[PDB]
Design a protein around this nucleic acid. Sequence first.
RNA 1: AAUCUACUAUAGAAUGAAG
RNA 2: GCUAAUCUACUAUAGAA
Lengths: 278, 278
Amino acid sequence: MPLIFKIGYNVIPLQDVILPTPSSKVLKYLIQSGKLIPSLKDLITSRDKYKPIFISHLGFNQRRIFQKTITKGSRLSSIIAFSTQANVLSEVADEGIFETVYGKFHIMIESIEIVEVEKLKEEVEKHMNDNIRVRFVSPTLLSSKVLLPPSLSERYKKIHAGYSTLPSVGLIVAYAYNVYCNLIGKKEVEVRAFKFGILSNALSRIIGYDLHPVTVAIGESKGNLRKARGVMGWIEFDIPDERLKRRALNYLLTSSYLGIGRSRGIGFGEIRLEFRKI
Amino acid sequence: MPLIFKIGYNVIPLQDVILPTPSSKVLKYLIQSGKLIPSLKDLITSRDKYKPIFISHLGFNQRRIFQKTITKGSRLSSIIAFSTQANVLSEVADEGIFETVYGKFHIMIESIEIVEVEKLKEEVEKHMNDNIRVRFVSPTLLSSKVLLPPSLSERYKKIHAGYSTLPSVGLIVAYAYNVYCNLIGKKEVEVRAFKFGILSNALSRIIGYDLHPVTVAIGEDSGNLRKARGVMGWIEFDIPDERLKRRALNYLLTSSYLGIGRSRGIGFGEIRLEFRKI
RNA sequence: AAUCUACUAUAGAAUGAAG
RNA sequence: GCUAAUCUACUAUAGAA
């Protein structure tokens, strides 16, 4: 029985500040420097695929700051979600005034939520008759080769397809499946994820969408800046196969906390999951 | 050996008229009534999957009529594309005044193009370094199950996934591949088509798009109306694998004449293929 | 039209192991 | 601004009085 922690933070700059690229770095720094929740150091540092940690970009108002100095007064928001076997329980309430390279900040907890993944299955059943709407509230980076036939992996290693700015259902649920599997210690699921995604976009029906490509910024190292293309907007679909829908709902429910796609550890692929009765 | 005939028509109704759903029916009637190009009756009557015949909707200013009366003076447009081994060369220039249930009409040819399909490869090489834009100028009906694993057809037969309102590249080029294979008499290619599409949307890069779902009307019968959901708009993509790009360019070249997706025989899936320097 | 890395790359994403 | 879809003699991943 593994758990997911979701902490909402208020982040206030104690001076006029210009935010780093990407914004998540600030809070990341605090965890890295062991200033808050030091027992996530490993998880922040891990280079492991689909690792269950998401640290968001800072949000202003109710929208993530899309990447410009920020005033001393401003009230920024952050969200961190993660799962670890480590005992982190005493540390999660960590807050206070902190000094970072980017400047001084007042970090105040707004919320703490603890989720048992087994209990998330209970939520699935109440949604088995709703349309599923996935909304990308931070730029989402979905690699197309996630639905490459795994036998062809060596063959097309040097091919850079990049990120689908036009996500299929199968790609979304295959990604969620990968993160979910890594979450519960299930290993070697390449084939299963592939078949799951292929069957999903063969059987799912897309009800509606409002999708647009987005150009996203990432840091600078030795001078080399980073940029990419991803997608934002939302998509609404249904799956007319029960088993497939139950699984997809499971993985997406986990994704509502941990994010979706590539580089969730620095704030990409933040989604909101919505449902609508028939 | 096989050829594609593409005839552009100017259609003027010799009275105030109200159009049938779908509009293609008008011109369709004429071919059935043998009043123009009678030796396509078979092809019109044919129930064969992916048969190489497209008769467009009318037909106004460089945009198809989205299906309420139209005036006697109006100059409507229509386009017909087809492939048959029969000799129809003498028949293609047929035109004049005709009597239909829908009214009196003046059909006058504006254009005729004859394409040897073997020669289309010649165009392929000219575009192997361009980005590809597929534009759906009539509502396009692409069944998602075209990328179902063929072994699973039986199992999920009673599942109606319907039409992808958010088409993947793989689905488009797989459809083009099916129509193309039926065109040159290469038969039973379900597995190769499936693999081709899967690999294609696993490897292709989507540059841009402006896609919207559209609700489309089709005729009545004995009555019971017909309706569906499809997609219109455009999509621009590239394929970073040379072989795959070559094949895709061939099949799409054929589809620019014969259309793409389901029900091309009544005017759906009309596309324009455009290109852009890298 | 879109990028760096010690190749986990279908990934991760500034190092305080501050001597 | 917006966002669920159909009849038929099964080639139905089709055709379309």
